[PDB]
From Swiss-Prot:
PROSITE patterns: FABP (PS00214). Belongs to the calycin superfamily. Fatty-acid binding protein (FABP) family. The modification N-acetylvaline is found at residue 11. It is found in: Cytoplasm. The gene is FABP7. GO terms for biological process: epithelial cell proliferation; fatty acid transport; negative regulation of cell population proliferation; nervous system development. Expressed in brain and other neural tissues. One of its GO terms (cellular component) is nucleus. A fatty acid binds at residues 136-138. This is Fatty acid-binding protein, brain.
Length: 141
């Protein structure tokens, strides 16, 4: 009933081609993660395209850039293995929390999370590691 209407309407809102339009404190966020000088210099100029789609029962997230191209495929709320763009081998869970799509990565006893939300048609991504928070805005292409 309302459960399937919530899950279908939420996933539908996020499924699009998203272009990065704005970044805030992403450099600090990469520094808190332990991303070195070399990669950070690339990461601060790289303009990603994020494609979110439904491929069967799975939700797919493709991050396309001149640095590295990543692709993750998952069932909502079911843990999966993920090798990140900065070569961290995580145990990750992508889930729904109200109007938010929450991505939690765990590796080496550490934890980082990315919260994606739709705000006035834009996708706002909040990246958190400890006290360090970054905000990235995306628009539909
Ligand atoms: O979603 C996006 O648009 C995202 F590409 F920027 O990825 C991300 F969501 F920000 C991340 F959280 F995945 O980033 C990261 F965690 F992988 C990272 F911070 F390590 O990123 C990184 F360092 F690898 C990087 F070099 F900056 C990078 F070039 F891959 C990029 F694309 F993220 F900027």
């Amino acid at each position: 009933g309302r459960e399937n209407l919530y899950f279908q309407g939420m996933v539908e809102a996020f499924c699009a081609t998203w272009k990065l339009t704005n970044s805030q404190n992403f450099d600090e966020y990469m520094k808190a993660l332990g991303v070195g000088f070399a990669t950070r210099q690339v990461g601060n100029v790289t303009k990603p395209t994020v494609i979110i789609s439904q491929e069967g029962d799975k939700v797919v997230i493709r991050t396309l850039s001149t640095f590295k191209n990543t692709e993750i495929s998952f069932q909502l709320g079911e843990e999966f293995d993920e090798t990140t763009a900065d070569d961290r081998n995580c145990k990750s869970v992508v889930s729904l929390d109200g109007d938010k799509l929450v991505h939690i990565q765990k590796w080496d006893g550490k934890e980082t999370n990315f919260v994606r939300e739709i705000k006035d048609g834009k996708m706002v991504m909040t990246l958190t590691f400890g006290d360090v928070v970054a905000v990235r805005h995306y628009e539909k292409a």
